[PDB]
Design a protein around this ligand. Structure first.
Ligand SMILES: *N[C@@H](c1ccccc1)C(F)(F)C(=O)O
Ligand SMILES: *N[C@@H](c1ccccc1)C(F)(F)C(=O)O
Ligand SMILES: *N[C@@H](c1ccccc1)C(F)(F)C(=O)O
Lengths: 641, 640, 640
């Protein structure tokens, strides 16, 4: 299952200490994200591939000096390949001068730049580039010392310009500013000095080897894919939590439905959902709910739940397939020419072309928009009492609703999030311009597309934060609902006894107490115009007709109504105040609820809780953003398969 | 390789005579396309494999419904109205169809409608729907007799409305119009009567079972995917023909380049291209071209060729992966509720949701726009003399270029095609509205997206037809080029002898004859301002300096004189002969022969009265109708 | 107001008999639409006005060209080939047409082609083109004889290729096919023969003059803009009908709201709605409805109604501004070079560039998607009982809702329509490719854009047809609702008397009869679990408490029981009578009368055999063919 694979990715991300870089061991997107996000993670360039790098650089320098005809080595660049030259080093310097052509408006973050440095280093290990081993050592040292050039955001059609800043750092260009850690910014020569390095003088092919790759597009794509995997699993998992709070019917996940429409992501998402819901105490409450006035309640849930495995299917498949493609790029010799020293030739192709990554970034962004739409639809149902099977509008606890609009602010924001996400999911690859003196008449735009997919995932994180916050609110509301109905049942049962009401009467009144949704009268339980009293009055008329001594019965019914308005509200208030100052304990989602409520220190939202929706959602968003959210996720999924 | 898989689809499409429909044998996109496109193809619904499970299921449903089992859309209302119950089993199903006959004629083609009928029939064979066997037999007979309802284009969010027209035909609704073949349209009851059927009276679940599927989206997606596979292979293949006519360097396809960046589609497209170009006689002309004035010509080709395997990789993978997804949908019980009669349950889910198809239709449309951009970039290079390595601008033969703008009209149209294609490739699935009393708060829009991808492929067909036409033109221009240079060399060599020029002078003049691109002076070979005489004059001045006289000057003046007597006539003669060879040893011979001989065309010029339209129409028609697969399969004979 | 301007356009469309083409009188979008759609409308080319300047100009060009003047595309090659000079004046023009007959049939409708012919003729009247007057006479004759070439859909980046087919017809190219009326297709030479014309022999500049224009993009844009104006006014107007049936509060249109946020389209749409709603019998019912249980009902309407003027503002302004721009293009010399014969120069520019039209087609398509979203929002509200203030879900009459899903099918199609419309409204102009040997490195794509906006308007027409059909259903439901509540009140009143209930009891019971929405219990009025009996039970218990006996209880039990004697029977009788009033005093009467009486429809239900398709088709056809303007103009009589 993809679920196992994604669990493996999260474990790899957490557990890795050293990234082995050797030209044979694959680097995964979890490795890239770990390097970028955990500075205790170190690169270990393992020589055992040094010999082949050396053979390659020796071949290049010798052949170039002998006058071999090799594009971008003894010839001009791009559309200028007709021009030949024996000025081997000057050719390489002229390239970097030409490409230091970005403008600061905004910049690629250090996370992306360090990731790109890793990916360039990795490419060099295959022994096809002709770069000196010493330059590779320097990259390893820069990576492990938290040094990176400041790189302008735009200019790549995929990654000459941004890679030129890494080259600029290595050759000690004074105009190139380098970061060391979070605040220090110094010119390149002093950055090199601070970490015990000296500037390189570029030899044959070395300028081109440094800039002629897909490292920035693929770096961003790697963290994008790591995040898309984690957030996909989170969304699939939270569909079960939605089913719990909305009073869904877990049958939507039945294996036979999916066996007969066997898209792999459809089968796998449902398999997870069936397992999450199998022993659910909330599904027990759901069954009890639909057995009361069965024929007045929907037979099936709305699509945002019942259709979730069908919806998720292409999203799972897209994200998993795109992960394979990005990792193939990470572990490639993206460079040109490709030096085949074993056969004494330089091969002229286009491995710098980032089209595999670019197209898949467009697809993943559409899939991400699909995930956001699922979240938006679920959230919408949860906010509307007509669709939420007993929950109050806006998940407002009240009881005074005139001064408690609940999660209405979050609801409005969810629409804004989904709307921007759908806009972002238009493709970038459809916008190919004929570029660079018409030499680059197809080009991938892969870094641009990866950047837009990253922006989409940022919005998805916000939507997940909100949805999880709303579902924790709904857990509290469902627990309080159960406690409140029992209080109402007990008060009605005991007052029927006290007032000496007949059994026909007692049975009718208890039915009303069980059947009427408590959140419809919580605001003023003894209001004669609200559903509890309306139900009770209807039943009182019916019992009088059924039993038709009349005057003594009426006497006792009037007394019942009097004592109800003296005690009911007080008992309902007490249980609520107690709750503010259980089913979730038996649920697979207990780790999420516990994390949000206890670990992040939050509570049921109301006019009495002084923290803002911002303050609460911020805590959840921060935990999604920094990866702490994977702890409850892995706890929740323990034992699955 | 995907190449063998696609060849397999093509052979299946052409070879199938009967489509077996039995609940276990898979239907591929080739089977769907063959049914749609070849009326000789018949459906064979196999009773022995599946009648028993179908009958068990319908009996179960009718018995449970009559006993008051609570089953959504069977004893309850539809969609947002599932909370209402009823024992009016038939009337409930009638009311559904009445409600859904809601399209407007401002239609879906018969190909798509018959494909959808096939797909609905297939869904029923899994024994989860509750429909009667007799209705399935009626669908088979309608399919085999070329009877299908006229269906409105729009209304589906994925396929209640369009499927209701098939239901409408089955129950003999007078407002539903049915085609019988190409020439007859009659009301539904008359159609049933003409093929010996009577209208069905809907039983429990049967109206819902007929409409609650993904049949139209998946029907369109199936022919879309068949076409996308064929056109993909054609585009990949034609990258090799482009290399041949543009004077490319075949090294771009070297397997080591792709071994070190091993996207499967990159490896596999390069593998095909290496094989197509191996020992090519055109690649031999290319080598010679780059050996002449070597240091003044590009070391590498432009991206439209050199970067082609890298570009193709995601496009190959998208199209092959979408094919798998669409075929899983074709072979699924797309219906709800799903009847597990063996365990006495009606299972409530959403197999009517066409999301797997819809999302993949969005992706394929992006991939098709990628294929179009590749074609546009190659065609652009081919039209511009600065980028075509000796070819004339617009592939104009002339010789009089003032009255021959060649393929400039096709070039303009290629920009228009690519532009519209890029626009079409925006996603449909990003436009989900919360629909049907907010019950359908996610919905796939799969049929809309499939229709847009279908529109995109129509345009790609146009682009391939033009590109292939242009490359046949370029084949003729390269062959004429080789013949012309030999004539110029012969005339120069024999006039050098005749005029008694030194061996030094003879050699210099022959180099110019070899080096100057003939298309730069074909218009007026002896014009002193054009590159032939310009090179000759330069060489004549140098030779006077190297030998320094009065008689040498006399002889060189006699050479120039005699050149203007002889050269143009001999060049005209060889061109005229050509209009009234390397391609014979090229793997692309079957394409050139198909376009020139079988479709009856010729090198384009002011002397050929057929318009670019007339020539491209023939090629486009052969792409549209499948004839193009013959030269394609011939071309690839022996590959792997 | 833009309202008066649109009424002006409609009147012109209907009343024009002859289009005057004279080089000074403007042609509007109503004129283009009328020529395209009304064949009795004839072109009148006026010689006295512009023949002299035409003849002066064609004489200047022929003389200058024959004398060797250097003029692009006249004595030089075309586009990227302008450096090539020639004295082959006629053959240069022939070579252009040959090169541009490059479209493929996979076609533009005759309406668009004939509109394009009108527009090319118009451009020629400015006397800047050099075309012969006789060619202009031939276009007038072809137009008036209903002869037009068959033109391929694609190939223009804006309109050389499609215009080449008009040129092909005029010069009698055999490969060009011509329509004569609805039924006849012949080769171009026979078409000319039948109208007494002979093939033209192109003189200097004339091939270019025929093709170097924006005629097709602008022809499509003209009918698009005419339709956008009519449909805009229809949507605005129908917002008032929506208010009436939804029980809106007309105060949203109050002039002060819009004076303080004075976007011209906001003020003018609100001004119309204020006037439409001012003496409304439905707004009277609305106010009565909100006076009953006032504090339990919304203070404000939802945005689809209350925010309509603010929403409409940019859409009105976009559509009106685009009309101006399109008309400027219709009335322009879109040609190149521009001959200034009076100053003896040929001016080299780019008036063939259709960028003004292209960009505005993108904007209008965005505005059309805005209008579609407004209709979708209103339709959605109307289908959902929680949002419709007493109307039944799906506007189902029932009474048995288990077999009446009302307009659910139409609701689903409205989501499908809006979804596709939002997708279409992505821009085309963002997809400029560098075209035609990189000569056309900016190009407008105006025809492609115009075509997409036309497709969006087709969808908007379907949405308006559905929305108007739904609102007529709602009118019937509101009128029936008022009649039904009166029946319930009378039954309750008389039974309360007959059972000898106290006056206080009678008054409480009557309040329930008035306050409970009748559509919540119409299905089974005496059902003890539905809201009528629930309210009566509560009231009966409260009476017992208030007066706290055995005779009171006996009489209350009799009241309840006798309710099932008469109530359902009288409610059935009044409904059945209705099936076989407020709208008579409403400004929307003409629409209701048009849909019900003129189109022959009725309140939708399980008893009415017509399908939703059959009903919506009639409304759609009337929108499409312009009949809908009759009730629109009647509705608006007396406005300002
Ligand atoms: N990627 C190409 C390039 C183009 C412009 C400037 C620098 C480099 C390349 F020419 F170097 C190549 O390897 O194809
Ligand atoms: N697909 C659903 C439907 C909705 C509206 C009209 C007809 C059918 C369904 F309700 F039938 C379902 O199976 O969920
Ligand atoms: N619009 C130009 C053109 C380009 C290619 C073929 C025909 C015409 C033009 F060159 F004619 C011009 O007027 O700029």
């Amino acid at each position: 299952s993809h679920v196992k694979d994604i669990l493996g990715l999260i474990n790899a991300f957490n557990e890795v200490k050293k990234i082995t870089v050797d030209g044979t061991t694959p680097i995964t997107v979890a490795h890239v994200a770990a390097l970028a996000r955990r500075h205790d993670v170190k690169v270990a360039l393992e020589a055992e591939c040094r010999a082949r790098v050396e053979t390659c650089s020796s071949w290049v320098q010798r052949k170039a000096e002998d006058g071999a005809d090799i594009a971008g080595v003894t010839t001009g660049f791009g559309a200028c390949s007709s021009r030949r030259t024996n000025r081997l080093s000057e050719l390489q310097e002229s390239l970097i001068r030409c490409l230091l052509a970005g403008v600061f408006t905004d910049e690629l973050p250090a996370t992306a730049t360090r990731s790109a440095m890793l990916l360039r280093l990795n490419s060099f290990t295959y022994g096809c580039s002709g770069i000196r081993w010493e330059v590779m050592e320097a990259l390893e040292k820069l990576l492990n010392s938290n040094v990176s050039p400041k790189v302008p955001l735009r200019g790549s059609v995929s990654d000459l310009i941004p890679l030129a800043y890494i080259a600029g750092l290595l050759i000690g260009k004074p105009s190139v500013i380098a970061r060391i850690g979070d605040d220090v910014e110094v010119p390149a020569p002093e950055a090199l000095s601070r970490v015990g390095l000296r500037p390189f003088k570029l030899q044959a092919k070395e300028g081109l080897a440094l800039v002629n790759g897909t490292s920035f597009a693929t770096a961003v794509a790697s963290t994008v894919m790591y995040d898309a995997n984690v957030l996909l699993l989170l969304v699939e998992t939270l569909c079960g939590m939605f089913c719990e709070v909305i009073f869904g019917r877990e049958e939507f996940a039945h294996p036979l439905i999916h066996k007969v429409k066997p898209h792999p992501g459809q089968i796998e998402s449902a398999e997870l959902l069936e397992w999450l819901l199998r022993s659910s105490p909330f599904q027990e409450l759901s069954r009890e709910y639909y057995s009361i006035d069965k024929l007045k309640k929907p037979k099936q849930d709305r699509y945002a739940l019942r259709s979730s495995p069908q919806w998720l299917a292409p999203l799972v498949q897209t994200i998993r397939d795109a992960t394979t493609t990005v990792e193939t790029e990470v572990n490639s010799a993206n460079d040109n020419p490709i030096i085949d020293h074993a056969n004494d030739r330089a091969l002229h192709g286009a491995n710098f072309q980032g089209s595999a990554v670019g197209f898949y970034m467009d697809y993943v962004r559409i899939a991400v928009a699909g995930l956001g739409k699922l979240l938006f639809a679920q959230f919408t149902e949860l906010m509307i009492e007509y669709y939420s099977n007993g929950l109050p509008g806006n998940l407002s606890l009240g009881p005074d609703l005139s001064v408690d609009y609940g999660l209405k602010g979050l609801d409005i924001a969810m629409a804004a999030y989904s709307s921007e996400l759908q806009y972002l999911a238009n493709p970038v690859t459809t916008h190919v311009h004929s570029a660079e003196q018409h030499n680059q008449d197809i080009n991938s735009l892969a870094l641009i597309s990866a950047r837009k997919t990253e922006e989409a995932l940022d919005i998805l994180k916000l939507m997940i934060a909100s949805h999880l916050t709303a579902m924790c609110q709904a857990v509290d509301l469902r627990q309080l609902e159960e406690a409140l109905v029992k209080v109402v049942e007990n008060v009605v049962s005991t007052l029927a006894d006290e007032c000496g009401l007949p059994n026909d009467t007692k049975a009718r009144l208890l039915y009303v107490a069980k059947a009427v949704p408590v959140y419809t009268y919580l605001e003023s339980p003894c209001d004669p115009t609200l559903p509890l009293l309306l139900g009770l009055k209807q039943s009182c008329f019916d019992t009088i007709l059924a039993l038709h001594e009349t005057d003594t019965l009426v006497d006792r019914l009037a007394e019942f109504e009097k004592r109800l308005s003296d005690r009911l509200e007080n008992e309902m208030t007490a249980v609520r105040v107690l709750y503010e100052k259980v089913r979730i304990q038996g649920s697979k989602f207990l780790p999420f609820y516990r994390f949000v409520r206890e670990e992040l220190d939050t509570g049921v939202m109301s006019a009495r809780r002084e923290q803002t929706p911002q303050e609460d959602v911020q805590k959840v968003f921060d935990a999604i953003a920094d990866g702490r959210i994977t702890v409850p996720l892995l706890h929740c999924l323990q034992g699955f398969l």
